[PDB]
Amino acid sequence: DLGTENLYFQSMASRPHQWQADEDAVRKGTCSFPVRYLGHVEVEESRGMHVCEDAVKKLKAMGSVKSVLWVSADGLRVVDDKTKDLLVDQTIEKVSFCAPDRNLDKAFSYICRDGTTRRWICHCFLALKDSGERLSHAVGCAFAACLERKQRR
Ligand SMILES: [Cl-]
Ligand SMILES: [Cl-]
């Protein structure tokens, strides 16, 4: 869809003195979060706070993998805890939108376009030690860092 959040505005709002460390970590490619990867789902939109919520409830009603979600300015990565296998390597430039969940506080998801499959694909998570919004803030820092480096280049 067409719809744009002011990234600067929401950066200034999200100021718990725990997330101060997250921003410098995302830029320095060291930022990680313990998660449970729910899976990917077809979604009818590139963005939507409720569109995500839906996609989460699809998977939560379907049937999860212990992993670590890594957040850098170049992309998001999910590494398996059991096998240490790289499960997901999603580039930050083809990520459309991300958001936490109004009704699942540990939930975090992001939408992305896959040009080969020609569809919008959500990717849901349940954080183990953190809140869903903490993760989303981290990925927003990526969105910012990306745009900022693309402007210099
Ligand atoms: Cl938005
Ligand atoms: Cl930088």
Q: Any idea which ligand is nearest the CA of 146?
A: 2
- Please give the resolution of this entry in Å, rounded to 1 decimal: 2.7
Q: Experimental technique used?
A: X-ray
Q: Any idea which ligand is nearest the CA of 99?
A: 1
Q: Any idea which ligand is nearest the CA of 2?
A: 1
Buried b or exposed e, range 87-117, using 16+ CB within 10 angstroms: ebebebeebbbbbbbeebebbbbbbbeeeee
Distance 21 CA to ligand 2 centre (A): 15
The CA distance from 3 to 44, in Å, is 15
* Structural domains present in the chain: 1-153 (2.30.29.30)
Cα-based torsion angle of the residue sequence 76, 81, 83, 86 in order, rounded to the nearest 10 degrees: 0
The residues after which the chain has a C–N gap greater than 2.5 Å are 63
Q: Any idea which ligand is nearest the CA of 4?
A: 1
Distance 82 CA to ligand 1 centre (A): 35
